[PDB]
Every structure is written in structure tokens, then in C-alpha cells.
């Protein structure tokens, strides 16, 4: 019933156009994408064990044109395997086209395309920062509730070849074993406190020793030493996260033990940033593809 290849074809038709051309799918096609993606999310672990080669991407925030550029540089699926670290909606102008293409690719390739949950894949957040207004304007409130039910089943973290830990925000003072993540039940909202909250909200800070209060008002900050101790305890080599705008699209921390990815160029306006995508080959040999602002 779900004509996936026609949906993807219509979503990719605006490839080659000036940034801003809309794709207006039907309400039933979008609701079909959400429900089928939701059941695929629930059938897969909440802590994904992934394998290289794959390409990792950071925040998109409804910048659909730059998502298509990112796919042009790294190859549209299934030419390359993808892992997104969340924050697909809000702030941008085309959050609907962004999330619909990512959900469709998740359904078309359930074992080579993966999406993690960001703090904006939460009804308490995306109601305010743009996604709800975009759903209400172009569709209805009922479709927004359907997106929420789908967002509550997104996986929380991913581990690539038992060596690269991936989440949207960062570490948590309540994260002692990876089994704690695997036991989180879905569907679930994002709490104001606890492990699930910190994995989507926390940030690294250079001027903090240990754990400190995050000026976002939510979760905590962690220093370069918490990263090194966390990597040594679980025999990991790198933490891969997003959640923060960075000038070059990437930013190292704790001597290349943690990296921050951001894939939305010209995000702040008052601060010009580039977008980056992390490419990892079979030997865990990593590099960066940079998306220069248009």
C-alpha cells in the first residue's frame, strides 16, 4: 500500500533546484512512512551495534537542500551506509521534506540507513521551535501527533564496530554499563532528568573538571577526563556526537577522543558555519567531507 519508490522519487525531484522548493506529499503517504518506520525502529535494538563502512552526519534542522547536497557528496543510498545523530526538524524551513526522506530511506534500506534520536525529536521541543507550526500550516495537528508517536521509538545510541560510541548529546553520570541503555523501553518521551535526557542534551566543556551544570538549563556538562575514563572503561576509541554548532562542521575534544558533527551550514546567521560529514571505512579509518555554505 505504501508506494515508497514514488514518494522517494517525488522527494528527489527538487534536486537541482534553488533552495526552497517544496514537496507536498499526501497526508496518508506521510502517515504511512511514520507507521512503517516506527515498527522498524521497535524491531531493532535501542542501542544499535553497527559496522563500517558508513557515513555519520549531525544536525540537519529542516535544511532539506543541504541534506540533498550531503547525499550528493557521500552518495545517495544504497551507495553508502548512513547514520544520523538526530535533530532533523525545527528552525529550518523544510523540516517535513527532511524527515520524510530520512524515514523513507529507513524503510527502503532498514539495514544500511539509521537514524538516532535528538533532543528536537521530542514533542515538548519541536512544538515550539518550528516543526509543529510547519505541520499545522501544511497539514494538520493530527499528523504532528503521528510524528511524535514515531519519534518516541527512535533509537538512542549506536556503537560502530565496538569502538565508536554515537549519541546526539553526550555522556551521562548515570551511564555505567551499556546494558542501561538497552533496557530503556519504547515508546518513551524524553524526561527532564536522567540517563535518556543526558544522552540527548549534555555537552562537553573544556573549562569544566568532571560534571557541571549545563547553561542550557537541562542535563550536565562533562570534561576531557570524563571522556578518557569512559573510553578506557568500555574499550572504546572515539565518541561521536552532535548537538552543538561548530565553525568547521566538526570539532575535536579531549585529544581526538570526542568529535562534534554539525551538518547544517549557515545555521546561526550571526555566525557563519560549515557542514561536515564523517566517513568511516572498513578499517575504522575516518575522514571528513565538508559542506561549504551555498
Amino acid at each position: 500500500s505504501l508506494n515508497l519508490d514514488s514518494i522517494i522519487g517525488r522527494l528527489l525531484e527538487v534536486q537541482g533546484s534553488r533552495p526552497g522548493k517544496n514537496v507536498q506529499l499526501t497526508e496518508n503517504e506521510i502517515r504511512g512512512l511514520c507507521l512503517k518506520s516506527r515498527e522498524i525502529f521497535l524491531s531493532q535494538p535501542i542501542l544499535l551495534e553497527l559496522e563500517a563502512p558508513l557515513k555519520i552526519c549531525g544536525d540537519i534542522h529542516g535544511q532539506y537542500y543541504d541534506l540533498l547536497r550531503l547525499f550528493e557528496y557521500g552518495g545517495f543510498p544504497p551507495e553508502s551506509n548512513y547514520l544520523f545523530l538526530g535533530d532533523y526538524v525545527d528552525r529550518g524551513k523544510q523540516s517535513l521534506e527532511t524527515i520524510c526522506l530520512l524515514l523513507a530511506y529507513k524503510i527502503k534500506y532498514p539495514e544500511n540507513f539509521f537514524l538516532l534520536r535528538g533532543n528536537h525529536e521530542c514533542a515538548s521541543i519541536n512544538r515550539i521551535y518550528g516543526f509543529y507550526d510547519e505541520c499545522k500550516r501544511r497539514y494538520n495537528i493530527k499528523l504532528w501527533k503521528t510524528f511524535t508517536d514515531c519519534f518516541n521509538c527512535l533509537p538512542i545510541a549506536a556503537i560502530v564496530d565496538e569502538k565508536i560510541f554515537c549519541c546526539h548529546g553526550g555522556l551521562s553520570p548515570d551511564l555505567q554499563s551499556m546494558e542501561q541503555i538497552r533496557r530503556i523501553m519504547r515508546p518513551t518521551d524524553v524526561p527532564d532528568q536522567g540517563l535518556l535526557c543526558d544522552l540527548l542534551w549534555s555537552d562537553p566543556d573544556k573549562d569544566v573538571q568532571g560534571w557541571g551544570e549545563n547553561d542550557r538549563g537541562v542535563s550536565f556538562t562533562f570534561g576531557a577526563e570524563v571522556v578518557a575514563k569512559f573510553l578506557h572503561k568500555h574499550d572504546l576509541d572515539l565518541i561521536c556526537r552532535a548537538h552543538q554548532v561548530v565553525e568547521d562542521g566538526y570539532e575535536f575534544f579531549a585529544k581526538r577522543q570526542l568529535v562534534t558533527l554539525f551538518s547544517a551550514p549557515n545555521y546561526c546567521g550571526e555566525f557563519d558555519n560549515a557542514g561536515a560529514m564523517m566517513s568511516v571505512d572498513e578499517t575504522l579509518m575516518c575522514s571528513f567531507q565538508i559542506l561549504k555554505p551555498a
Binding site: N112, I164, T260, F271, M285
Partner: peptide
Amino acid sequence: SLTIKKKVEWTSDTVDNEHMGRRSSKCC
């Protein structure tokens, strides 16, 4: 094939921008 179930190193063009004073923001 499939993705879902070594040491991490970086290529020569990859630079370490940690101590390069790169600006970062948490929101806007």
C-alpha cells in the same frame, strides 16, 4: 550489504581544531 551486528585513526588531511579557538554555540 548490512551494517547492523580495529582501531580508529584519521587521514592526513584531517586537522585537529581543538586548540584552534573554533567558535561554537549551543543554541541561537
